[PDB]
Design a protein around this ligand. Structure first.
Ligand code: HEM
Ligand SMILES: [Xe]
Ligand SMILES: [Xe]
Ligand SMILES: [Xe]
Length: 183
């Protein structure tokens, strides 16, 4: 993934647990050689997966729990680190934002030519609910989507309940989330 993602992981861990903890995690991920992540540079997905695993071991938390926290953090991180206007242009409510998400990544894909973005499709069930279809070239990131949606809920001051109903992991075609939102 692009270095931006790795910078954000490093940033989250450093802020919450300090530099020493970050250094340990980086060491254990086998990335001692890397002095810093370059934001607009493409890295092997392995770099990100090794960071998550090492963080899980060092911090004593399941990787999935960390993915949730990271998904939430990313919504704030992007708005403060160069993407605030891009986010604002994707709308002012949870449902409109999720509708624009493919188009937002298309725009992101202008500047990050090698992007492999997720694909998100919305089926609205009411004015307070939707089924969200999540398709990816990558495994294991559904928990991050859950945290992202909560991050978006906080962004729009909107209560959200997210329950995963299909798992690309129990053999379903792709992840599907049922979402309830009020405000
Ligand atoms: C301005 C805001 C954002 C920017 C600049 C951005 C950029 C990126 C980048 C660089 C990646 C790495 C993909 C790669 O390197 O191939 C990514 C992946 C991803 N993004 Fe976005 N993103 C933004 C907002 C969001 C939001 C609000 C969501 C909410 C769902 C989201 C969902 C995801 C997911 C789930 C992935 C995992 C990639 C995958 O599934 O394969 N992003 N994004
Ligand atoms: Xe991300
Ligand atoms: Xe990630
Ligand atoms: Xe993480």
């Amino acid at each position: 993934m692009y270095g931006l993602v790795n910078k954000a992981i490093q940033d989250m861990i450093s802020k919450h647990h300090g530099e020493d903890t970050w250094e340990a995690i980086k060491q254990k991920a086998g990335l001692e050689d890397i002095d810093f992540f370059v934001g607009m540079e493409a890295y092997s997905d392995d770099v990100t997966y090794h960071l998550v695993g090492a963080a899980s071991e060092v911090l004593g938390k399941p990787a999935e729990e960390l993915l949730i926290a990271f998904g939430e953090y990313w919504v704030t991180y992007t708005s403060e680190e160069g993407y605030g206007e891009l986010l604002a242009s994707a709308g002012d409510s949870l449902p409109e934002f999720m509708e624009n998400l493919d188009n937002l990544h298309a725009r992101v894909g202008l500047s990050f030519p090698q992007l492999r973005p997720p694909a998100f499709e919305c089926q609205h069930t009411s004015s307070k609910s939707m089924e969200l279809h999540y398709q990816s070239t990558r495994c294991g990131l559904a928990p991050m989507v859950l945290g992202l949606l909560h991050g978006l809920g906080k962004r729009f001051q909107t209560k959200v309940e997210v329950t995963q109903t299909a798992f690309r992991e129990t053999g379903e075609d792709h992840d599907i989330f049922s979402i309830k939102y009020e405000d």
